[PDB]
Structure 1
């Protein structure tokens, strides 16, 4: 089935983080593609990917990178689609550089930014799901189930 979400990441080293977005989309049965695209090492690959995303049928892009993390913002520069940004935890600055590089977009070109690291990757996929759910009733019910199970599954007290 044709992908409706693109997951892109700046490097293989981001995969340990971005796999959490991939897994969540698969759990909810959201067809998606998962690609490496570097804003800096493959800038024309990025331009082409972002420019053609909509005509290819993508609805949402999830972009993850670390450091001077420009992949989400430059993707949003070329697509009208919603772009969600995952700050990957960097070694020295723990993703604060990633976070500021992604979230602080000037007015005109948005990136919806999620938490640093694996939680943000998971939430980027959930956010993409909640967007798709607006016009896909079956997916909306599966998302409702997912959220209900999350809530119901929280224990009442810690295990010691």
Structure 2
């Protein structure tokens, strides 16, 4: 049973959103991934969000660029934590994506991460952290993962 839903407005955002999914896979967290568009499939977006809780999801990761409304509108329709990944847009390099996602009004939080693939990775990790707040096995896995990277960086980053 999926614990995290990873959604995005278009297939073109997949190369960004796959980073989140890779993290979930690495950590063996069950998830689903779907294209759900705020602007092209608005009714479907509402159905997806409003039924997430009953479907067993605990966290939603939503990616969008430009006038990026997907994370906020999903957030307006569920009280699951919603993590917003600003996709890097062509003209404004994700500045529009960022402001469109992060500047939510009081009452409807969206947990916003960095523009692009770094943010996407981080959305997966943040979802895992949210689960880890109550599943010690996931928290332990996150700790070990971080420890392993710390060692790799401190001990195996030779400069020539």
- TM-score normalized with structure 2 length: 0.97
Task: Give the secondary structure class of the aligned counterpart of 2:76.
Answer: helix
| Deviation of 1:138 (Å) | 1.3
Q: Name the CA distance, whole Å, in 2 between partners of 1:91 and 1:103.
A: 19
Q: Name the CA distance, whole Å, in 2 between partners of 1:21 and 1:74.
A: 20
Q: Name the CA distance, whole Å, in 2 between partners of 1:149 and 1:49.
A: 37
Matched, 1:35 2:34: yes
Tell me the equivalent position of 2:159. Answer: 159
Tell me the equivalent position of 2:18. Answer: 19
Tell me the equivalent position of 1:99. Answer: 98
Tell me the equivalent position of 2:2. Answer: 3
Matched, 1:61 2:60: yes
Tell me the equivalent position of 1:70. Answer: 69
Task: Give the secondary structure class of the aligned counterpart of 1:135.
Answer: coil
User: Higher mean Cα deviation, 83-92 or 139-148?
Assistant: 139-148
Q: Name the CA distance, whole Å, in 1 between partners of 2:63 and 2:159.
A: 34
| Deviation of 1:159 (Å) | 2.7
| Deviation of 1:158 (Å) | 4.1
Tell me the equivalent position of 2:121. Answer: 122
Could you list the per-position Cα deviations for residues 36-85 of structure 1 after superposition, in whole angstroms to 9, with x for gaps in the alignment? Answer: 00000000110000000001110000000000000000000000100000
Q: Name the CA distance, whole Å, in 2 between partners of 1:38 and 1:8.
A: 9
Task: Give the secondary structure class of the aligned counterpart of 2:133.
Answer: helix
Task: Give the secondary structure class of the aligned counterpart of 1:62.
Answer: strand
Could you list the per-position Cα deviations for residues 99-132 of structure 1 after superposition, in whole angstroms to 9, with x for gaps in the alignment? Answer: 0000000111000000000000000110111110
- TM-score normalized with structure 1 length: 0.97
Q: Name the CA distance, whole Å, in 2 between partners of 1:149 and 1:42.
A: 42
Aligned length: 159
| Deviation of 1:155 (Å) | 3.9
User: Higher mean Cα deviation, 65-74 or 142-151?
Assistant: 142-151
